[PDB]
Design a protein around this ligand. Sequence first.
Ligand SMILES: NC(=O)C1=CN([C@@H]2O[C@H](COP(=O)(O)OP(=O)(O)OC[C@H]3O[C@@H](n4cnc5c(N)ncnc54)[C@H](OP(=O)(O)O)[C@@H]3O)[C@@H](O)[C@H]2O)C=CC1
Lengths: 297, 110
Amino acid sequence: LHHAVIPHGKGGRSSVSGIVATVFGATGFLGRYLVNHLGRMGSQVIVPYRCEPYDTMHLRPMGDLGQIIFMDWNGRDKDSIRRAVEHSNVVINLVGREWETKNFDFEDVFVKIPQAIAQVSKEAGVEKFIHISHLNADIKSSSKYLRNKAVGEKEVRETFPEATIIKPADIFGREDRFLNYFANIRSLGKKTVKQPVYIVDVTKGIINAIKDPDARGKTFAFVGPNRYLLFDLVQYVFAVAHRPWTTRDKVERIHTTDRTLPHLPGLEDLGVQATPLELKAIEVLRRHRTVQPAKTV
Amino acid sequence: MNLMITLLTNFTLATLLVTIAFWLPQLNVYSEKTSPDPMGSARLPFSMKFFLVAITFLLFDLEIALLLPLPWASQTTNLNTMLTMALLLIFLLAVSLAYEWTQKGLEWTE
Ligand SMILES: NC(=O)C1=CN([C@@H]2O[C@H](COP(=O)(O)OP(=O)(O)OC[C@H]3O[C@@H](n4cnc5c(N)ncnc54)[C@H](OP(=O)(O)O)[C@@H]3O)[C@@H](O)[C@H]2O)C=CC1
């Protein structure tokens, strides 16, 4: 171990945590709270950004001086990825889109970018790699999202054999697109079962997978403590939020049930107590205000 | 007809400007804001004084409504009667003001 990366201090803001993290896609919903929780330990966080630097401003209070290093990257360029990962001891991949664009489809985002990041981090001497897939990823799935995400999971597992793959089901938080999608839709009720996981639990799980050496090469499934049907979940969201842009792929993924994977470990094996929806859904949905809790299965 | 077309055109232009001002900045995708005053949560207490100056306006505006045909009333052939009633109406507006003065009516909106 090198001398500059030995953990010192009391784990606060100006301490040293020994984590040199490269978070691809840190300018999103999960990268926000991940760079927050890494920066409060005193980690050297490298944020490659595609967007305007203005859209990185909220990542700047998250650490001490010189702790977040912003740099440009292209998702089709291995050279900028190598420029961003050649000093890191852990590489987290959070690059994703709910919809396809003209320049990037689901295959450009979920398959080629994670394979490129994991392969270039394999040839750069990175110890720890973390890939974030979806719990309902399947090759023969109805949605192109989950199909290309399962293919990208398979490619990351075959190009970085020690990679930690993480399956959150449907993450809710303040900047999510799960409870805020339901609160503004004003689609229906079906036989779909969902267990949503909370974003601070996902972030604590990602960090406890960074710190654990026994999480190398595992596949985790981050799920909440309660499975809900889709209809009474949506009605409970309308009940908390005091109420009476889309694609067909999002509709295919809301009406797809969250699969139970008992053979994969979860948040309880990373020391994370799963926070239920009834404690944090008010914190999420107090924004939408101008309550009987939902029945499980 | 020309006046109605002009009113319709001005209302249409104002509606189009308010429509642009409520549709054009909405097409920016910036960020949704979480957790979106001198008094905390209290009821607005009713003030007697603002209601008094409102009713005083209403009564003197009625007296103005009586005074408004004077530029036409000065053309009459009964000018002694007309001058007497014109001076009488402006004097009654002044007596309403003097009674509003002297009985502590114009207070803290003086
Ligand atoms: N409900 C959830 O949140 C769940 C999410 N996941 C997965 O977790 C990951 C992160 O989730 P989330 O925060 O919600 O996603 P976001 O859309 O909020 O964040 C995606 C990040 O990746 C960047 N990015 C997107 N497309 C590209 C691209 N083509 N090239 C380069 N950078 C790109 C975005 O930057 P920019 O601002 O420039 O677009 C942003 O920084 C995703 O892979 C998602 O599939 C898994 C399970 C559940």
